Write a protein that binds this ligand. Sequence first.
Ligand SMILES: CC[C@@H](C(=O)Nc1ccon1)c1ccccc1
Length: 186
Amino acid sequence: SMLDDAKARLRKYDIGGKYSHLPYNKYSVLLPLVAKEGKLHLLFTVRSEKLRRAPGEVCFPGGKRDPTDMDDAATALREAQEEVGLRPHQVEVVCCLVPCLIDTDTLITPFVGLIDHNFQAQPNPAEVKDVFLVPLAYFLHPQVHDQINHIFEYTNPEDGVTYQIKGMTANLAVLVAFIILEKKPT
Ligand SMILES: CC[C@@H](C(=O)Nc1ccon1)c1ccccc1
């Protein structure tokens, strides 16, 4: 099936806990895969205009590890619940992808999760201004704008609203698309 095929591809890139104990400032992100209308989509947040770090930017759900978290996957799931109302029974964590090093002292660990078909996002307005889906296939043929820094522009055909996706967030979206969609019979 579509979903079994995606998880099988993803597992081949799982690094597991290999880099998890190193002495960094630690953050996790959840890359949430949603199936709709026979295709896979990624779920993105727009950060509230009132936040300290990067107000109004497009990001995946995530945040800083705290002492309660059993592991890095737990960080991602706790944060996703707080931001968009995703409960643990509503997500299957499939793997841990290559981590992102920043600022010489920070390590960000990305997890890919498959989302239940009955999940409906409840944006927490203290943290998130908006939540939206993008088809995974978009990231194979994006609409690119050069700011040089490459920026993706996605327009939602339901309402005509355009979102800008850039940086680590855009890079991780492309990676997931390549892993799942490369070399497929039509
Ligand atoms: C690790 C932090 C995460 C984030 O802050 N997620 C949030 C917060 C409110 O809404 N979405 C993120 C992911 C990707 C790029 C920048 C930041």
